[PDB]
Structure 1
Amino acid sequence: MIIPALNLIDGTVVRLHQGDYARQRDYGNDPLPRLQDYAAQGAGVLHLVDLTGAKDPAKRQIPLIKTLVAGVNVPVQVGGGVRTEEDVAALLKAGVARVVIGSTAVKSPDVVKGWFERFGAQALVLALDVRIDEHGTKQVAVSGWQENSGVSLEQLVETYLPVGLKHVLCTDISRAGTLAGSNVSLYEEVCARYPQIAFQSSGGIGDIDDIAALRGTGVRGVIVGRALLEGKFTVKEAIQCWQNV
């Protein structure tokens, strides 16, 4: 499944280089027609990150997210700044298909385990976004990726498997927003080690060949952000690539 992504800062569509808030490129303040064009090209799922909320959970763009979710007729997943059980419930009530959770899943696993019991594993996506160190450890970043948790992707996956973890979004932060290509070896590895998890690849797609390159990894979703904003290819072309590979 190709999953087009938009990232939002104070109403504006942005790209961050490797998630660095000091390295923005701006793409206007009309995300809704963008999403609607993605849906008309065939997108089956859409992904939204509230970057303002990820940086400060008190400043989440809640009215805007509601407007975007209500404005398309395909499932939308939303992340960025979610901290409480009430946060999750409100997003689901507003029509969000899946809520994406990074920071709190690392910091408070007892709490997030209770969310799995309440909402079900189909409603939650864990964002296990990583900076891979020189030893190979896949260290998960938190707080809008501004902090290194010092906890490995695998430790966190094993933490939530017994409560039915099903969906994981895994960004290679070094690739995010760079057009350099996604980390094929990373997804080959993690998908094979956890066949019961539906992984979404994330970060780095630069052209259609980069999508084709993921064909044998086993990922269930392919997130694409910057390349679609820059028009390297269309959603229609991306979908055709993934269907055929």
Structure 2
Amino acid sequence: MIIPALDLIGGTVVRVVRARLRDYGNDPLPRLQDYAAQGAGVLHLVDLTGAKDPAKRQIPLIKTLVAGVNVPVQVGGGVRTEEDVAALLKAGVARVVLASTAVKSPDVVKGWFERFGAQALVLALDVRIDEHGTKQVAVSGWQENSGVSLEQLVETYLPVGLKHVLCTDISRDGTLAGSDVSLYEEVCARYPQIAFQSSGGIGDIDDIAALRGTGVRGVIVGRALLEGKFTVKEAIQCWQN
């Protein structure tokens, strides 16, 4: 499926561009609602306010947004503790997106899988392809690699039933550059029991077409939709054909 995505900061719709941020206004709910109206089955939100300060997690806004659409929303941003996870689920989010903590504290996160179930969690892994061609996990675009490959980390979580992995190619994140097809083709084939989501690099409908035969289950689209390159409807039509 197509997974429309919005980045929120103090209720302001934004997205990382390449790394800067641009303001797409302050009415996230009508946006999401129109995404859903066009047939989206899943939505993605990053709470950048919550990411910077867990105590400032935009729980009331998140509640509103979730309540305001009829589809599961996966929500990330500053998910550092078991309490963060529970708070977001309690607010009504369908899945909690675990990013840096998934790399940082795998044993702790495996316990979260045990408590919340694999359907409640998405592991968001940023990947750099190094000089050797290894898919290196990094916790962000501005930090060095963390010393673990995508495969090794995925393998870490398979024993607790890992089902959802969001994989961002760091080089293409928010660049409109076209996503990295080979990366997704390899991982998806290796772990067919996992539903991979691709993120970054979607600039036009052709980028979505490029992902079709790869095994990638979901395609995060943020920037392209905000900039009017194509619609959710067109993205879905392309994705499904």
**Shorter-chain TM-score tier:** over 0.9
CA apart distance, 1:68: 1.1
Unaligned runs of 5+ in 1: 17-21
CA apart distance, 1:207: 0.8
Q: Report if the CA contact (8 A) 1:51-1:144 is conserved.
A: no
* Secondary structure at the counterpart of residue 165 of structure 2: strand
> Percent identity of the aligned residues?
97
Provide the alpha-carbon RMSD of the alignment.
1.5
* Secondary structure at the counterpart of residue 145 of structure 2: strand
Q: Distance in 1 between matches of 2:55 and 2:138?
A: 20
Q: Does 1:62 align with 2:55?
A: no
Q: Report if the CA contact (8 A) 1:54-1:143 is conserved.
A: no
1:194–1:242 distance in 2 versus 1, CA, 3 Å:
same
1:65–1:146 distance in 2 versus 1, CA, 3 Å:
farther
Q: Report if the CA contact (8 A) 2:126-2:140 is conserved.
A: no
Q: Report if the CA contact (8 A) 1:200-1:220 is conserved.
A: yes
CA distances 1:84-124 after superposition (whole Å, capped 9, x unpaired):
11211121122111111011111111111111111111111
Q: Report if the CA contact (8 A) 1:169-1:199 is conserved.
A: yes
CA apart distance, 1:55: 3.3
CA apart distance, 1:58: 3.7
1:79–1:144 distance in 2 versus 1, CA, 3 Å:
farther
Q: Report if the CA contact (8 A) 2:199-2:220 is conserved.
A: yes
CA apart distance, 1:131: 2.1
**Residue matched to 1:223:** 220
* Secondary structure at the counterpart of residue 216 of structure 1: helix
Q: Report if the CA contact (8 A) 2:181-2:214 is conserved.
A: yes
CA apart distance, 1:143: 6.0
Unaligned runs of 5+ in 2: none
**Residue matched to 1:208:** 205
Residues matched between the structures, number = 239
* Secondary structure at the counterpart of residue 3 of structure 1: strand
CA apart distance, 1:139: 2.1
CA distances 1:101-155 after superposition (whole Å, capped 9, x unpaired):
0111111111111111111111111111112222222222226864532321111
Q: What TM-score do the two structures reach when normalised by structure 1?
A: 0.93
Moved over 4 A (4+): 143-147
CA apart distance, 1:28: 0.7
CA distances 1:203-225 after superposition (whole Å, capped 9, x unpaired):
11111111111111011111101
The 5 A counterparts of 1:1-245 are 1-16=1-16, 23-142=20-139, 146=143, 148-244=145-241
Q: Distance in 1 between matches of 2:138 and 2:100?
A: 8
